[PDB]
Amino acid sequence: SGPIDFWSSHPGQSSAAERELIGRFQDRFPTLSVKLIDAGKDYDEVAQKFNAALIGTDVPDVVLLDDRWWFHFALSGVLTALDDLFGQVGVDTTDYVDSLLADYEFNGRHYAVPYARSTPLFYYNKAAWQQAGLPDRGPQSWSEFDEWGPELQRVVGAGRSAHGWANADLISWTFQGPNWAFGGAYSDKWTLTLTEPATIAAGNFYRNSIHGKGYAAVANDIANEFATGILASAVASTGSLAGITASARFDFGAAPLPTGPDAAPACPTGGAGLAIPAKLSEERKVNALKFIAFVTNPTNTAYFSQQTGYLPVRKSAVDDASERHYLADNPRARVALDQLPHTRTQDYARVFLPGGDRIISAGLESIGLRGADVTKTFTNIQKRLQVILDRQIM
């Protein structure tokens, strides 16, 4: 009871934008109120808190669930299937970007609505690029960047790195694209492929950049380490574009990831959507979908996108006057939009296999941190994952 409880992690440092969308929602429906709740510092903390709440009584009305947690909770049956609610509220689902809404479809039903959606971006420091003699653009291939790497490392010097790789908090997501660009994958649908020769090749490229040629390092806060100049470049979310833009005292570029052979997609989408706990009453499920649909309407997804660097989730958001000027005056904000139709759906091992991402991410960090053998590390992870698969299947 009481207001609509909105549990968010304020992704992209977006709490101010969310308070503002709440204002728009309350002027539009003077009858309903919202309480924005700082439910956690990242998607894992929000999901942890939701888990605890489900065993209890006080469940939120609206909860932010990332590209892994929505499926975990949907498959657990704790989330409202929304397809009939879309019709009852008048949601124009044809207007959401189709790939972004299909990201939440499970067995014919949708269990969340896209909200803070992203692609990774190749951020690069332009002063470093100029010092190294590079052209003003991202690498076209990870092989080309392997040639830039040592040149950048020389100009940035001793307490800096040409490239920062994310730590376990995000490496499974940022390494996904390069893996694809090499023709690898964690898995192909449910079949694991971490020990295919192309996946290992991508692994060794990552390992060699840190321990072989030594122009790359495993970062902590990758966005801030890039913005403060410690990393000459990094793959991080477009969701961090506003924060990086506020802190960086140098000019910088954002580029799409290197594609695969013959421009085959080599970039994931990511981020989170809004969902409604199944154990709410039918009235609160109505108001909750009212809210979710409002703050993700054309004008409002355009606004949230302007404040963060995330993608507008509605096709017609680019019909919005402010969004056209914004994209006009902010080219780095175009990059994720232009990249969106060159993406590839995420490997099942990362997003759907229960516990898969924790295992994959640890393997990748262990490779990065201590230079663990890649073939050995990938074999052990794939065997521990295959154990999961065989168990859940049974």
Closest-approach residue to ligand CH5 (CB):
270
- Across 39-77, the runs of DSSP E, i.e. the strands, are 62-66
Q: Which stretch binds ligand CH5 (CB under 6 A): 105-113, 123-131, 264-272, 369-377?
A: 264-272
Contacts with 305 (C-beta within 8 Å, 6 or more apart), sequence order: 311, 312, 317, 323, 333
Task: Say how far apart CA 3 and CA 159 lie, in whole Å.
Answer: 50
Return the residue of 260, 271, 277, 298 that touches ligand CH5, per CB under 6 A. 271
Q: Which stretch binds ligand CH5 (CB under 6 A): 24-32, 235-243, 275-283, 376-384?
A: 235-243
CB atoms within 10 A of CB 6: 24
Q: Which helix (H) or strand (E) holds 144?
A: helix 142-156
State the minimum distance, in angstroms, from the CB of residue 376 to ligand CH5: 26
Q: Per-residue x/- marks for Mg ion, 1-30, CB under 5 A?
A: -x--x-------------------------
Contacts with 354 (C-beta within 8 Å, 6 or more apart), sequence order: 72, 388, 392
Residue 11 site contact among Mg ion, ligand CH5, none (CB < 5 to 8 Å, cut-off depends on kind):
ligand CH5
Q: Per-residue x/- marks for ligand CH5, 62-81, CB under 6 A?
A: ----xxx-------------
Q: Is residue 231 close enough to count as binding ligand CH5 by CB under 6 A?
A: no
Residue 118 site contact among Mg ion, ligand CH5, none (CB < 5 to 8 Å, cut-off depends on kind):
ligand CH5
Across 366-385, b (16+ Cβ under 10 Å) vs e yields bbbeeebebeebbebbbeeb
3-state secondary structure string across 268-291: CCEEEEEECECCCCHHHHHHHHHH
Residue 5 site contact among Mg ion, ligand CH5, none (CB < 5 to 8 Å, cut-off depends on kind):
Mg ion
Contacts with 282 (C-beta within 8 Å, 6 or more apart), sequence order: none
State the minimum distance, in angstroms, from the CB of residue 313 to ligand CH5: 13
Residue 2 site contact among Mg ion, ligand CH5, none (CB < 5 to 8 Å, cut-off depends on kind):
Mg ion
State the minimum distance, in angstroms, from the CB of residue 166 to Mg ion: 35
Return the residue of 7, 12, 289, 291 that touches ligand CH5, per CB under 6 A. 12
Backbone angles phi, psi at 350, to 5 degrees: -80, -50
Torsion sign across C-alpha atoms 177, 183, 186, 188:
positive
Residue 66 site contact among Mg ion, ligand CH5, none (CB < 5 to 8 Å, cut-off depends on kind):
ligand CH5
Residue 347 site contact among ligand CH5, Mg ion, none (CB < 5 to 8 Å, cut-off depends on kind):
none
Return the residue of 82, 116, 280, 311 that touches ligand CH5, per CB under 6 A. 116
Q: Is residue 258 close enough to count as binding ligand CH5 by CB under 6 A?
A: no
Q: Is residue 56 close enough to count as binding Mg ion by CB under 5 A?
A: no
Task: Say how far apart CA 130 and CA 269 lie, in whole Å.
Answer: 30
Per-residue tokens: 169: 């908090």
Q: Are 69 and 7 in contact (CB under 8 A)?
A: no
Residue 239 site contact among Mg ion, ligand CH5, none (CB < 5 to 8 Å, cut-off depends on kind):
ligand CH5
| Edge-to-edge order in the sheet of strand 216-218 | 216-218, 163-165, 233-237, 120-125, 252-255
Residue 173 site contact among Mg ion, ligand CH5, none (CB < 5 to 8 Å, cut-off depends on kind):
ligand CH5
Q: Which residues of the shown chain bind Mg ion in the complex (CB under 5 A)?
A: 2, 5
Q: Which residues bind ligand CH5 (CB under 6 A)?
A: 11-12, 66-68, 116, 118, 173, 237, 239-240, 270-272
